[model samples]
Target: SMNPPPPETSNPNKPKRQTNQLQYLLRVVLKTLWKHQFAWPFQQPVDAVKLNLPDYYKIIKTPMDMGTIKKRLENNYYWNAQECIQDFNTMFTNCYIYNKPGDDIVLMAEALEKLFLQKINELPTEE
Candidate 1:
């Protein structure tokens, strides 16, 4: 008989690493990227659907309605196409503040972060 491997362990007490923290936020943006790549292209003409979202998701041939739209909003998927770009800008700023990576990109990243914050703040909300 063969012995089984030990179960995976997690520590509630352990501190989260900075690399993982930034990676987590980066992944959130990437997930929306995935959602858009699939959902946005062929969405049926739906006025009820929010502006930035696709009419459907990976879950297809089911139903595309307000419920689906609501899910899109919460999925970190935006109805506004520009939201991904905006999200990236936001993430850049946050990572700069939180991670402060000691590298050559630091200055360039900071410049972009400040620039993005200024520009994003100037944008108006959409319905």
Candidate 2:
């Protein structure tokens, strides 16, 4: 329906973000998952160890996030989120088979129907 509501929050006065489309998507799909712990995401190294895909360590040579998670805000910055979005975007570009247009469309549909929808639906009610 309506442009999906901004991530549900406890405070009403928190300034609404002027997020770009990609930032909004990243916020919803990955940051929301990480914040809520709905499921530990694997968008970047911070999330990788949480859901250890087989051979993740062997395959990914990038450094991992070993520190505990912290809060992010307009005033505060999160380098991990920025890094994760880049990493995952690269992964998506590399993995999406351009020649397999038929299957790729199907995968897109499936993603919107299942993965994206499911994750967004799991958003928290409040702080």
Candidate 3:
């Protein structure tokens, strides 16, 4: 008879667990983006008004234009929203974890969108 192989041991010092978590997160983010058909950097239109504002005014108004700063904000938002919905569906198919579905992913995407818009709005306008 053939001898059985020994069981593998887990290492506490190794970052296996942490790495797995990070990988999972990255996978989810990438999947979300891909599913929404969003290119890595989703482009957005710039706001002329914000760009023409004075330096101080522009700085104060940077966070208002969600369509200019980062071209990918909309893409991120779209993907995140889709991912959240998918996650909810999956969770429901598996087992209901909470009474209401979670919106953390969507919310995060929205926040990033807002931030990017703000940053873009702060830039000076080209002649």
Candidate 4:
């Protein structure tokens, strides 16, 4: 009988490990784009759920009650929604700042990072 061929060894430099890192980075990039590019349309649904006409109009008109504002934000603003709006605003602003021609991935990424940092700084303390 013919001898069986030796088993192949796994490659130490296999691309599998890199796949996960690439996936994670891609997720972050895509999520950021989705949030920022789609903030208005995306938030419309959440805003509809959280906002009542009278109360929403009142807040927009007066802007007096922090409680009301907080409540509205808490109820309507999904975590990612806030992230998206914040990033979108930053991205828009940065494009103007850099005098860039138009929306681009790099500008959007910069905006996302900036907004992410801003939100991180805004977290409430437990004191």
Provide the global lDDT of candidate 2 against the true structure: 0.37
lDDT of 4: 0.35
Candidate 4 lDDT over 14-115, as tens digits, reads 322323222322244334434675333222211323433333332332122122222333333222334333433444443344334445634544555565
Worst 10 residues of 3 by lDDT: 1-10
TM-score of 1: 0.28
Q: Report how far residue 108 has shifted in candidate 2, in Å.
A: 17
lDDT of 1 at 93: 43
Where does the lowest 10-residue lDDT sum fall in candidate 4? Answer: 61-70
Runs off by more than 4 Å, candidate 4: 1-34, 38-103
lDDT of 1 by residue, 1-127 (tens): 1212221123345433323323333344333333443333222322324533342222222223222323333453442435334445443443344334775435544554455445445444442
List clash counts for every candidate, in order.
3, 0, 4, 0
lDDT of each: 0.37, 0.37, 0.31, 0.35
List TM-score per model, in order: 0.28, 0.27, 0.21, 0.22
Which regions of candidate 3 deviate over 4 angstroms?
1-102
Model 3, TM vs. native: 0.21
Distance from true location, Cα of 75 in model 3, Å: 20
Task: Put down candidate 3 lDDT per residue, 71-114, tens digits, no spaces.
Answer: 22222322333332343233223222212244553443444444
Return the number of clashes found in candidate 1.
Answer: 3
